[PDB]
Design a protein around this ligand. Structure first.
Ligand SMILES: *CCC(=O)NP(=O)(O)OC[C@H]1O[C@@H](n2cnc3c(N)ncnc32)[C@H](O)[C@@H]1O
Length: 427
């Protein structure tokens, strides 16, 4: 056999690519059954030489707020549910303890008795942006060790990632759509996946990734809850998340960084009454007031509506593309790149045709048409806003939306947003 706790020979050729290169502290509310209290320094918990050596190389000093509490929790083989939007070091909060256990316990007898890749740990992410950030920090801490990480994501060459996987992966970072695609090709097996991490689970649900995430976790060879160690990270906490955290976690601990609640902030919501005849006019005025290069996403409810609306905006001179299924994958994936960088800063789309597509973080979401469920509305307006700047979500309301009047109202009050006075007088 072999050993996975002794650092391998270094290579000065490799330090160059990895270590070439912030707030303070904020309140925590760690509610859990019999959880271990946090730590103050990395030297407190004996994580391992391969980790400690790599910690120095990136000039890591003190563990961040979430890293103080989450790190001792994970290495104690306890499921975690961390809800923290204004928390720095959310990604390294799980990488250090997970990799510390893999270096200690080893890969397990199943892998060493072998010579389709079976990764030990799996990290799910919503965006290609966040997937690579986790992957590049994984490389930073898997250096000088026998763990090789791999990343896959949608909207890229699948053949080059397959060639990357076959080179051997133990810690895989993936978006849910591309991971399911790898599994159907017999390239990835979750049989020996011990550590599961769902990073930014809220934004993963807003993009329509749940059927994949449940296909990955609940409908394959993924070891069951209790056998695997599962962590979750998210900013919001709707009914969708707590139900998901109930199915995916076994007797977990809840972490909180100050402001913790459903309906992410940094998103200003405006609701206006617009009859169907005036939606075109109202949208035009809404676009004439738009910033110079502010990216805008316009949801509609049908395929015919999305085509007719995109035709409207093009005949008015606005640079806009569309995605609505009736245009094949050659035009849809082209619309992303055209929208991801100027060119067509107005993307008309439907709720279904945007499922799992990494929209380039829009600045203004416009619900030209409204759905029939308040949970879909949370998904759609979740396409805007980040951990930093403030976003905008305008929604056109009329008599076709009495169904969601009460739910939209209470949602606005919970989000501390302005409430149209007539909306109260409709419930
Ligand atoms: C508030 C910051 C945030 O929201 N996330 P982040 O900026 O992506 O934080 C991770 C980046 O900062 C570096 N990092 C993470 N943790 C530490 C510690 N403890 N010391 C020094 N640097 C840290 C990571 O390298 C990552 O780039």
């Amino acid at each position: 056999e072999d050993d996975w706790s002794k650092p391998l020979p270094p290579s000065e050729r490799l330090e160059q690519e990895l270590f070439s290169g912030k707030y303070d502290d904020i309140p925590v509310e760690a509610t859990g059954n019999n959880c271990p209290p946090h730590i103050e320094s990395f030297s407190d918990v004996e994580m391992g030489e391969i980790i400690m050596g790599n910690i120095e190389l990136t000039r890591y000093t003190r563990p961040t707020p979430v890293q103080k509490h989450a790190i001792p929790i994970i290495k104690e083989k306890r499921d975690l549910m961390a809800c923290a939007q204004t928390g720095c070091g959310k990604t390294a909060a799980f990488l250090l303890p997970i990799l510390s256990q893999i270096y200690s316990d080893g890969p397990g007898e199943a892998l060493r008795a072998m010579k389709k890749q079976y990764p030990i740990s799996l990290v799910l992410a919503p965006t290609r942006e966040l997937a690579v950030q986790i992957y590049e920090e994984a490389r930073k801490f898997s250096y000088r060790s026998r763990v090789r990480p791999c990343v896959v994501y949608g909207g890229a060459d699948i053949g080059q990632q397959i060639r990357d996987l076959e080179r051997g992966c133990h810690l895989l970072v993936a978006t849910p759509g591309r991971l399911v695609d790898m599994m159907e090709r017999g390239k990835i097996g979750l049989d020996f996946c011990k550590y599961l991490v769902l990073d930014e689970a809220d934004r993963m649900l807003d993009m329509g990734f749940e059927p994949q995430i449940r296909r990955i976790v609940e409908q394959d060879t993924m070891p069951p809850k209790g056998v695997r160690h599962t962590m979750m990270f998210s900013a919001t906490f709707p009914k969708e998340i707590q139900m998901l955290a109930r199915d995916f976690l076994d007797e977990y601990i809840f972490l909180a960084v100050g402001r913790v609640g459903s309906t992410s902030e940094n998103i200003t919501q405006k609701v206006v009454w617009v009859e169907e005849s005036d939606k075109r006019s109202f949208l035009l005025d809404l676009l004439n007031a738009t910033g110079k290069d502010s990216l805008t996403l316009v949801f509609v409810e049908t395929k015919k509506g999305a085509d007719s609306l995109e035709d409207f905006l093009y005949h008015e001179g606005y640079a806009c593309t569309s995605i609505h299924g009736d245009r094949s994958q050659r035009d849809r994936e082209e619309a992303l790149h055209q929208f991801r960088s100027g060119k067509s800063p107005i993307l008309v789309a439907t709720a279904v045709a945007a499922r799992g597509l990494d929209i380039s973080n829009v600045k203004h979401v416009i619900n030209f048409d409204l759905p029939s469920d308040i949970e879909e509305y949370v998904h759609r307006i979740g396409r805007t806003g980040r951990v930093g700047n403030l976003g905008l979500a305008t929604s056109f309301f009329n008599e076709r939306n009495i169904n969601i009047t009460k739910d939209l109202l209470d949602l606005l009050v919970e989000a501390k947003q302005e409430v149209p006075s007539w909306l109260e007088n409709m419930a």
